[PDB]
Amino acid sequence: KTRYYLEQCIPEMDDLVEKGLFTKNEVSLIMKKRTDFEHRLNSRGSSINDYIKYINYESNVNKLRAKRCKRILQVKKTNSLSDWSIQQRIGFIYQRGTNKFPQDLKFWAMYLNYMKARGNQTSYKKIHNIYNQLLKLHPTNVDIWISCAKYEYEVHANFKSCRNIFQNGLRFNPDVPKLWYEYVKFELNFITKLINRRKVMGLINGDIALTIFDVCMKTLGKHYINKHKGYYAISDSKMNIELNKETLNYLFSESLRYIKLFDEFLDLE
Amino acid sequence: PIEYLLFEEPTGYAVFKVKLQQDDIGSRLKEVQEQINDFGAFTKLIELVSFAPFKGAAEALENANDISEGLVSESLKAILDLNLPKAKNITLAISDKNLGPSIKEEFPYVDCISNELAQDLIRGVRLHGEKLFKGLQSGDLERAQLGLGHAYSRAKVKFSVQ
């Protein structure tokens, strides 16, 4: 069905010549290369690199069109299919690549970055669904959970949503000390902003983390006990005593990082 | 009336979404049965929607038991919670009827299926195995099955190095 994708380009390419930005011969060069790319994607042996090179191609085509618009048309945006057509396609190619290669973590990031960069074109809701899909293919990679938690605490400043991320992320990945460290880091940021707002409120006129500290310590030990024991319990008493030693030291080191973390927050006691 | 399919792997738990519903009246027709063997046809029926690998060897055995006595683990609860919409009632296809009541208790809004239609798809999922995971990291099932095998067995017999 390579043609079916190809025919979608014709109304766009017709718009280019009609506006006069691109000559007949020039567009033929564009369509030819597009034709070459589509066959590669639709064929066996296609790789994620194949989607990347195609995606890079349109971006340069997009730059040529807009840059040409100022030189020839002398208009910021010509009201026609051409202006938003390329941007629709690039997202479409990406979606195919993500579906075609969900495993490649790298290729997703381009979509989140690409989708995020053109915020005006692309509503945050579209960004949400991609994260919903991406978390949900890879629940065990903590680095998503912080990433989407990150995005909606800075771009949107919706702490209620960001907190739910850590709650869900911790539900899947309770043994990752980093995400706990990341979750307490967010909470203390929320408290510091809140009290600073309170200070500003006066001028113009936290315990929660410690609970995270405590509950974190219990589960990490529980999982660290699970590992180093394998399928079965340890019959030897002395070895069982040892397994208590590593967790204490592992938990002690895991505590010590927070002791460093608290040091940053001057506002807090 | 099925939309989501629950499957379990030695590496983890896999959920599938049923894009197309096979004919139920003609379930026994050779032509529908040949499709289950055919990977190309099968991919049109379902699509892998989630996979959450087990954290380590210990977790797999614990879940391997919990599946055996028809119980829901914390890992299973988390996955189903994230995937199944609240919704009249979303339908989930499951191999075990005994896991049915357990799933219903934790999630009142899900209705489980274990009819031959569900079994037919579950067979297809297990037929193609890692090919349906579309490149996702599921290790090697055959070795992981070997990994859990005596591990599940020796546990019940209470085998020990002593």
Binding site: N132, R163, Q167, L170, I208 | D81
Partner: peptide, 28 residues
């Protein structure tokens, strides 16, 4: 559709969710 961004349980499934919400009711 089920979304991680909005909590879908309507009750706190994880014991963490029990502890945090207790403070939030306590705080304000």
């Amino acid at each position: 559709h089920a979304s991680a961004f909005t909590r879908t349980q309507d009750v706190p499934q994880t014991e963490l969710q029990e502890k945090v919400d207790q403070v939030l009711q306590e705080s304000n």
